[PDB]
């Protein structure tokens, strides 16, 4: 399938190389971790790469299932 990249280019769903069997959604905190919450760096991965402390990652196998929720003014 294809995944969007918030961490590399701007944001576009491009097919990924061999290895990541699906897409994913990571979250954490940018350079200063502001009050705007964390970021939303989805992309590709072999499997839900979630880990231990605050690395909150997720997955996405449907078509363009990596569109985090943010396009909307308060």
């Amino acid at each position: 399938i294809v995944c969007h990249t918030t961490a590399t280019s701007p944001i576009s769903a491009v097919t990924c190389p061999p290895g990541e069997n699906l897409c994913y959604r990571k979250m954490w905190c940018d350079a200063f971790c502001s009050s705007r919450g964390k970021v939303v760096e989805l992309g590709c991965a072999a499997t839900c790469p979630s880990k231990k402390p605050y690395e909150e990652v997720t997955c996405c196998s449907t078509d363009k299932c990596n569109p985090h929720p943010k396009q909307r003014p308060g």
Binding site: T6, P10, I11, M27, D30, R36, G37, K38, V39, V40, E41, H68, P69, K70, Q71, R72, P73, G74
Partner: peptide, 13 residues
């Protein structure tokens, strides 16, 4: 300027 969890269009500041 990010795709943070509160907007998507690259914001300046």
């Amino acid at each position: 300027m990010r795709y943070y969890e509160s907007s998507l269009k690259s914001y300046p500041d």
